[PDB]
Symmetry: C12
Subunit: 94 residues, 12 copies
C-alpha cells in the first residue's frame, strides 16, 4: 500500500516556493522498490504537493532551479504510519 | 503562526540603504520550513521592510548591489517571541 | 529449467519506470550458461517485466536512460525456487 | 538619536583636501545599524563635512583618489557624547 | 581422433546469444596441435555450436563483439572422454 | 595655529633646484590633521618656499622630476616652535 | 644427410592453418649450418609440410599472418633421429 | 658662506678630460643643504672647473659618458677650510 | 701464403642462402694484414664461396639483407692449417 | 711634474705593433689625477710611443684591434723617477 | 735521415685496399719534426705504398673512405732501423 | 740583439708542410717585449723560415688551418744562445 504524503511547501518567510522538484532516493531494497531508484514530484505554484509513497527508507532531495541539491535528510515509512506532511517525517524521532 | 518583523534599516550616517535585499536561510528544518531554504525581501526606496517569519533558527544575509554578501548573524524565532525590528533579534541575548 | 520471474517495476512514489533495462550477469558458469554473459530485457510502458531465468548466481544491473548504471545486487536461483518478483530475490536471506 | 559631527578637513599645510570621501564601517550590531554597512559622505570644496551618526562602534575610513584607503581608526559614540569634530572622536581616550 | 562437442549456447535469460565466437587457445604441445594456435567457429542464429576437438589442454575464449574476451576456463580432453557439451568440460572436476 | 616655515632650498653646489616638490605626510593624527594625509606645493623658480604647517609630527618627502623620491626625514612641530627654515627642523635634536 | 620432417598442421578444432610459416633458427653453429640462420617455407592450404633438416639444435617459430610470432619451442636433430612429424620433436623428452 | 673650489682636471697622461661631469651627492643633513641632493658642474674643453660648495659632507661622483660613475670619496668642508682644488679634499687626512 | 677456404653455405632447411656477405674483421696485427680491416666475399646464387685467407686471427661476420650481422665467432689460421670449409674453423677446438 | 715615457713597441719577432693602444688607468687618486681615469695614446706606424705621465700608481693596458685586452701590469712612477721606456717601469723591482 | 718504408697492405681475403690513406702523427717532437704534425699518403690502385719517414715516435692511423678512422697503432723509427714494410714496425717488440 | 732562428719545417714523412703559421706568445716581461704579444711568420712553399727573436721566454704555437693550435712548447733565449733551428730550442735541456 501507498501512504499519502500531502502538504504545502513554504520558505522561511511564509511564502510558497516555486520551481521546486522533490526527489525520493531509495537506499535499501523493499518489497516493491528496487534500490537506487529516484521518484520525482513537482509542486504547483501555490506550493501544494501530494504523493503516494511506498514503505521503506528514503533520502529526500529538494532542487529549486538554481540550487544544488539540498539533502533534507532520511525518511522512513513502516506499516504503522498515518497520512501526514513531509516535514513531520523529517522531524520525527527516528 | 508567523511573527511579524517590521522596521527601517539604515547606515551609520542615518540614511536608507538602496538596492539591498534581506535573505533568511533556514539552518534547521522545522514543522513548516525545510532545511536550507532562502526567503528574500527587497525593501522600498525608504528602507522600510515588513515580513512574516516562521519559527526556527535562521541565518541572515544582506546583499547590496556590488558589495560582497554580508553575514549579519543568526536569529531564532520561538513560540513566545513578540513582533519587533530585525535588529533586536540580532542583538538578543543568546 | 527456467524459473519465471514476473512483476511490475515502480519507484518510491508509486509510478512505473520508463526507458528501463534489466540485465542479468552470470557470475559463475553453470551447466546451461557460460560465465560473463549478459541477458537483458526492457519492461513495457506500464513497467511490467517477465523473464525466464536459468538457475545459478547472477548479478542484477538496472539501466535507466540518463542515469549511471545501478547495481541492484546479486540473486541466487536454485533448482527449488518458485516463481516470483525479482524484488523478493534481492531481499531474500543469504 | 544621531550625534551631529561637523568640521573642516585639512591636510598638513593648512589647506582643504578635495575629492575626499569619509565612510563609516560598522563593526558591531547596534540597535539601529546592521553589521558591515558603509555610509559615505563627500565634503565640499572648502573641506566642510557634517554627518548625523547613530550611536555605536564604527571604523572610520578616509578614501581619496590617490593613497589607498587610510584607516584613521575606531570611533565610539555612547549615549553621552556631545556634538563635535571627527578628529576629537579619533583622538578621544578610549 | 576428434571428440565431437555439440550444444546450444544460451545467456542467463534462456535465450540464444548471437554474434559469438568460440576460440580454443592451446596452451600445451599435443601430438597434433602446436602451442598458441586458435580455432574460431561462429554458432548459428539459434545458438547451436559443434566442434571436433583434438585431445589436450585448451583455454576457452568467448568473444561477443562487446565485453572483452571472457576467459571461461581451461578445458582438458583426455583420450577416454565421451562427446558432450562445452559446459560440462568447464564444470568438470579437474 | 600653523607655524610659518619659510626659506630657500638649494643643492650642494649653491644653486636652486627646479621642478622640485615638498611633501608633508602626517604620520600621527592630530586635533586638526587626520593621519596619512599629504600636503605639497611646488617651490618657485628661485627655490623659495613658504608654508603654514599645522602642529604635529610629519615625514618629509623631496620629489624631483626624474629622480626617485627622497626621504629627507621627520619633523615635529610643537606648540613652542618659532618660524624658520625647514632645514633646521630635520637637524633639530630629537 | 638430412632428416625428413613431413606431416600436416592442424589447430585445436581440427582445421588446417592458412597463411602460416615455419621458421627454423639455428641457435648453435654446426658442421653444415652457420649460427643465426633461418629457413622459412610456406605450408599449403591443407596444412601439409615437408622439410629436409640438417642436424643440430634449432628454435621453431610459427608466423601466421596477423598474429604476433609464436615460439613453439626447440628441437634437436641428432644422427640417430628417424623421420617424423614436427610435433614429435617438440614433444620429445629433453 | 660658499667655499670656492677651482682647478684643472687632468687624466694620467697630462691631458684634459672632456665630456666630464662632477656631481656632489649630499649624504648628511646640513643647515643649508637637504640630504640626497646632487649638483653638477660640467668643465670646459680645457678641463677648468670652479664651484661654490656649501659646508657639509658630500660624495663625489665623476661621470665621463663611459666607465661608470667613479666614487672618488667623501669630502667634508669643515668651517675652517680655505679655497683649493678638488684633489686636496680627496687627499686630505680625514 | 693464403689458405683456400671453400665451401657451400646452407641454412637449416638445406637450401642455399642468397644475398649473403662474409666479412673478416682482423683483430690483431699480422705480418701482412693491418688490424681493423675487413674483406668482403659475396657467394653466388647456389651458395658457393671461396676465399684466400692470410694467416692470423679473424672474427667472422655473416651479414645478410635482413637479420642483423651475426657474429659467428673467431677463427685462427696458423702455419699448419689445410684448406677446408669455413664451418670447420668455427667448430675447431681452439 | 710629468715624467717622459718614450720608446718603441715591438713583439717577439722584432716587428712594430700596428693598431695598438696604450691605456693608463689611475689606480690611486693623487694630487693631480683623479681615480679611475684612463689616458690612452696610439703609437705611430713604426711603433714609436711618447707621453708625459703624472706621478702615482697606474695599471697599464694594451689594446690591439682584434685581440682581447691585455693587462701588461702595474707601474708606480715616483717623484724621483727618470725618463725611460715603460718596459723598464714594468720590469722594475717592486 | 729518412728510413724508407715500402710494401703492400692487404686485407684478410688477400685483396688490396682502395680509397685508403695512411697518416703518421708525430707524438713527440724531434730535431727534425715538430710535435702534432700529420703526414699522409694515399696508396695506389694496387695497394702499394712507399714512404720515407724521419726518426722518432709516431702514431699510425688508417683512414678508409666509408669507415671511421682506424687506429693502427704506434711505431718508433730509431737510427739503426732497416727499410721494411709498415707491418713489421707494428709487430716489433716494445 | 735578436737571435736569428732559421730552418726548414718538415712533417713526419720528410716533406715540407704548407699553409703553416708560427706564433710566439710571450709569457714574461722582457726589456723589449710586453707580455702577451704575438708575432706571426708564414714560411714559404718549401717550408723555410727565418725570424729574429728578442731574448726572453716564449711559447710556440703552430697554426696549420687544420688541427687546432699546437703547443710545441716553451723556448728560452738568454744572452748566450747561438743561431740555430727552432727544433733545437724545443729539444734543448731546460
Amino acid at each position: 500500500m501507498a501512504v499519502k504524503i500531502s502538504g504545502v511547501l513554504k520558505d522561511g518567510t511564509g511564502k510558497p516556493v516555486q520551481n521546486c522538484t522533490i526527489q525520493l532516493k531509495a537506499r535499501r531494497n523493499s518489497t516493491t522498490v528496487v534500490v537506487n531508484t529516484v521518484g520525482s514530484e513537482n509542486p504547483d505554484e501555490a506550493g501544494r504537493y501530494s504523493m503516494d509513497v511506498e514503505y521503506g527508507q528514503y533520502s529526500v532531495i529538494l532542487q529549486v532551479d538554481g540550487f544544488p541539491p539540498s539533502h533534507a535528510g532520511t525518511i522512513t515509512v513502516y506499516e504503522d504510519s498515518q497520512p501526514g506532511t513531509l516535514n513531520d517525517f523529517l522531524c520525527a524521532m527516528t
